[PDB]
Design a protein around this motif. Structure first.
Motif, PDB file in Angstrom:
ATOM      1  N   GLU A  11       0.837  -1.174   0.000  1.00  0.00           N
ATOM      2  CA  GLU A  11       0.000   0.000   0.000  1.00  0.00           C
ATOM      3  C   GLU A  11       0.883   1.238   0.000  1.00  0.00           C
ATOM      4  O   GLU A  11       0.666   2.161  -0.756  1.00  0.00           O
ATOM      5  N   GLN A  14       2.752   1.588  -3.338  1.00  0.00           N
ATOM      6  CA  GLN A  14       1.839   2.015  -4.379  1.00  0.00           C
ATOM      7  C   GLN A  14       1.491   3.482  -4.234  1.00  0.00           C
ATOM      8  O   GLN A  14       1.393   4.202  -5.219  1.00  0.00           O
ATOM      9  N   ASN A  15       1.297   3.932  -2.997  1.00  0.00           N
ATOM     10  CA  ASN A  15       0.932   5.332  -2.771  1.00  0.00           C
ATOM     11  C   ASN A  15       2.076   6.247  -3.187  1.00  0.00           C
ATOM     12  O   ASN A  15       1.869   7.241  -3.867  1.00  0.00           O
ATOM     13  N   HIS A  16       3.295   5.859  -2.844  1.00  0.00           N
ATOM     14  CA  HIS A  16       4.466   6.606  -3.277  1.00  0.00           C
ATOM     15  C   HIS A  16       4.621   6.609  -4.783  1.00  0.00           C
ATOM     16  O   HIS A  16       4.928   7.626  -5.371  1.00  0.00           O
ATOM     17  N   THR A  18       2.351   6.476  -6.996  1.00  0.00           N
ATOM     18  CA  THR A  18       1.343   7.306  -7.665  1.00  0.00           C
ATOM     19  C   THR A  18       1.358   8.765  -7.160  1.00  0.00           C
ATOM     20  O   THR A  18       1.474   9.712  -7.932  1.00  0.00           O
ATOM     21  N   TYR A  19       1.287   8.967  -5.857  1.00  0.00           N
ATOM     22  CA  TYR A  19       1.250  10.343  -5.350  1.00  0.00           C
ATOM     23  C   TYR A  19       2.607  11.052  -5.223  1.00  0.00           C
ATOM     24  O   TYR A  19       2.706  12.257  -5.462  1.00  0.00           O
TER      25      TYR A  19
END
Ligand code: H15
Length: 236
Positions: A11, A14-16, A18-19
């Protein structure tokens, strides 16, 4: 992996991806606070309940090193004291896998406030490229977790962190008979740090300290990797 933190790791990664990789130069929520050579440090001013939370994002480009190498050095606890200057003590609380560990550390008192400690999972991952025309991505994620062996301190305020060092290697092979050397590689780095100080302190001072300390670390740490890898075969 099979350790209990695999889902959280995925998680966070993935957040890194994308954001955190999003371009911030033309984003007016962000301010360019530090520039020097290929290094740029930006911050977003954010507080909740009077507590300063300012997301920090830095970008850099470092000649002669790969993203794999930069991430290895950043993650490897055996060289931590060679480059880190803000820590008082640290130790590894648990080893989760060959690429994942939990670390407890106390920091020097850089803020006009009580000493902070932190307890975080530190993980190194490769994100494969979709095509051979793109760089593979290496990322080290340091994010806070709880652990029975490291409960709240009596003396320290527990900060909480979500940090990523994300790196990609660009290569420019030489035109003719020469083999690729370190003159032909450049590492693009994006470093993001979200730190919750865990209690109040004057924003003006915390912001000055961040403006001083992050660029100091990035220069020292990247210089360190350049020095330690100089003359060695390239680890892609
Ligand atoms: C978290 C405790 C807050 C006390 C220190 C105040 C902030 C000072 C700026 C330090 C910049 C250098 C960061 C190097 C850095 O990324 N350090 C690693 C390895 O020690 C842990 C880390 O991912 C972390 C990031 C930000 C703050 C603390 C720990």
């Amino acid at each position: 992996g099979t350790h209990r933190f695999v889902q959280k790791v995925e998680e966070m990664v993935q957040n890194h991806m994308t954001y955190s990789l999003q371009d911030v130069g033309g984003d007016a929520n962000w301010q360019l606070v530090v520039e020097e050579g290929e290094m740029k440090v930006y911050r977003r001013e954010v507080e909740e309940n009077g507590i300063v939370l300012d997301p920090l994002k830095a970008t850099h480009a470092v000649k002669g090193v790969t993203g794999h190498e930069v991430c290895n050095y950043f993650w490897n606890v055996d060289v931590r004291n060679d480059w880190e200057t803000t820590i008082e003590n640290f130790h590894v609380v648990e080893t989760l896998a060959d690429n994942a560990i939990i670390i407890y550390q106390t920091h020097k008192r850089v803020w006009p406030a009580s000493q902070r400690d932190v307890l975080y999972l530190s993980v190194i991952r490769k994100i494969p490229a979709l095509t051979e025309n793109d760089p593979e991505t290496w990322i080290v994620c340091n994010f806070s977790v709880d652990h029975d062996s490291a409960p709240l301190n009596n003396r320290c305020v527990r900060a909480k962190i979500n940090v990523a060092m994300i790196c990609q290697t660009l290569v420019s092979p030489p035109e003719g008979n020469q083999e690729i050397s370190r003159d032909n590689i450049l590492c693009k780095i994006t470093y993001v740090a979200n730190v919750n100080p865990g209690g109040w302190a004057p924003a003006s001072v915390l912001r000055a300290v961040a403006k001083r300390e992050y660029p100091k670390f990035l220069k020292r740490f990247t210089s360190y990797v350049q020095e330690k890898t100089a003359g060695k075969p390239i680890l892609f």
